[PDB]
Structure 1
Amino acid sequence: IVGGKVCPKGECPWQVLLLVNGAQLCGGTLINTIWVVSAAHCFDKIKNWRNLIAVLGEHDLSEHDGDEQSRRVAQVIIPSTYVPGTTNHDIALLRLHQPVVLTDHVVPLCLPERTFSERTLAFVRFSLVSGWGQLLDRGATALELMVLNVPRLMTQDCLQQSRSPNITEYMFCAGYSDGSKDSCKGDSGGPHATHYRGTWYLTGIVSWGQGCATVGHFGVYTRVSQYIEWLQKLMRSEPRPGVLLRAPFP
């Protein structure tokens, strides 16, 4: 996260850290005790799926304070329409091997209904994005979880202001074009969360952009509203052998 602030411990309790062989991979969002939403592109280069771990309750990577809960990832589910190496359909649904325990520091974010998300949440201007990603373009990553408030643009306005991959109906733009504030590498998979009448909802996933905080460009986020029905159906289904599952989309 570029130009944000430290998220006070416990104020981003749905944030997930994904690790492979102990190294930081990506972010994610807890939406129930065994389900995490992340970005499909985070998994393009995984060789052995047994080395993938999700951490909930994390805040400061330099210390163990006892609020952290680690789980093996049992399934990574990606839409059939996602093509490795590209940007469209950048979403993954992860099933944890065992549930996390909800606590003051571990709480799921609400996955909204599609209509509510499209008719109401889509018009809330500002939303929060978070992660342990790079604090600058070409810079070191964060030791403490960072958070940033970003405004959402209609895609017509994003294209008119941006001065390359297309912005599809499965994406939206958010942030600032003046080079000051953006999500970055290492934040991929993390939540774009929107507050509405006292409750926070998942509206986006950190996906891609041109460098980070590049003048004339905005961050691009997966438009989660397009995937609600897809996600809900998968969460109602029985697990299948083999970590990686490609599931038909729509």
Structure 2
Amino acid sequence: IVGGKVCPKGECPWQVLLLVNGAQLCGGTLINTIWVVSAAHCFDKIKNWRNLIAVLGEHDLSEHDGDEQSRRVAQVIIPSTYVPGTTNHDIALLRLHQPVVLTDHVVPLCLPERTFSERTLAFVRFSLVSGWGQLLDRGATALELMVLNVPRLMTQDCLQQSRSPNITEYMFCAGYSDGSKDSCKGDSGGPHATHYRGTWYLTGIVSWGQGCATVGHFGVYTRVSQYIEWLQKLMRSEPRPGVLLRAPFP
């Protein structure tokens, strides 16, 4: 996260850190005790699926304070329509091997109904994006969890205001074009969270694209609303052997 601030400990309790062989991979979002939403592209280069760990209740990477909960990842589910090394359909659903325990420091973000998300949430201007990603383009990653308030653009407006992959119906733009504020490498998979009448909801996933905090460009986010029904169906399904599962979309 570029141009944000430290998320005070416990104020982003749905934030997930994904590790591979102990190394930072990506972010994610807890949506219930065994389910995490992330970005498909995070898994493009994974060799050994068994070395994937999800951490809840994390804050400061430099220390252990006892609020952290680590879990193995049992399943990584990706839509059939996702093509590695690209941007469209950039979403993954992860099943944890064992549930996390909800605490003051570990709480799921609400996965909204599609209609609600489309009719209401989509029109809330500002939303929060978070992660332990790069603090600057070509810079070091953050040791403490960072958060940033970004405004959402209608796709027509995004295109107009921009000056590259297409912006599809499965995406949206948010942020700033002045190169001051953005999500960045290391943040992918993390939440774009939207507040409505006293509760927070999952509306986007930090995806990827061209540079971070590049002048003339906005951040690109996976449009979660397009996937609600897909996610819900999968959450009702039994696990299958072998970590990676490609599931038909729609």
- TM-score norm. by structure 1 comes to 1.00
Deviations 1:1-48 (A, max 9, x none): 000000000000000000000000000000000000000000000000
Paired with 1:150 and 1:139, the residues of 2 have a C-alpha distance of 21
Q: Identity over aligned residues, as a percent?
A: 100
What's the CA shift string for 1:161-193, capped at 9, x where partnerless? Answer: 110100000000000000100000000000000
Q: Helix, strand or coil for the counterpart of 2:239?
A: coil
CA deviations on 1:79-128 (whole Å, 9 max, x unpaired) are 00000011000000000000000000000000000000000000000000
Contact 2:87 2:209 in 1 (8 A): no
Q: Deviations over 1:203-244 (max 9, x none)?
A: 000001320110000000000000000000000001111000
C-alpha distance after superposition, 1:131-156 (max 9, x if no partner):
00000000000000000000000000
User: CA contact under 8 A between 2:75 and 2:96: conserved in structure 1?
Assistant: yes
Moved over 6 A (4+): none
Cα contact 1:132–1:141 (8 A) shared by 2 = yes
- 1:152 and 1:85 mapped to 2: Cα distance? 25
Say if 1:16 and 1:28, in contact at 8 Å, map to a contact too.
yes
Secondary structure in structure 1 of the residue aligned to 2:32: coil
SS for the counterpart of 1:151 is strand
Partners of 2:17 and 2:24 within 8 A in 1: yes
CA contact (8 A) 1:132 1:145 kept: yes
Number of positions where the alignment pairs a residue of Structure 1 with one of Structure 2: 250
SS in 1 for 2:207: strand
Q: List alignment gaps of at least 5 residues for structure 1.
A: none
* 3-state SS of paired residue (2:84): coil
Contact 1:209/1:218 (8 A) holds in 2: no
Report the equivalent of 1:55. 55
Q: What is residue 126 of structure 1 aligned with on the other side?
A: 126
Distance in 2, matches of 1:125 and 1:114, equals 18
Give yes or no for contact 2:81–2:249 (8 Å, CA) kept in 1.
yes
* RMSD, aligned CA: 0.3
Alignment of 1:16-35 (within 5 A): 16-35=16-35
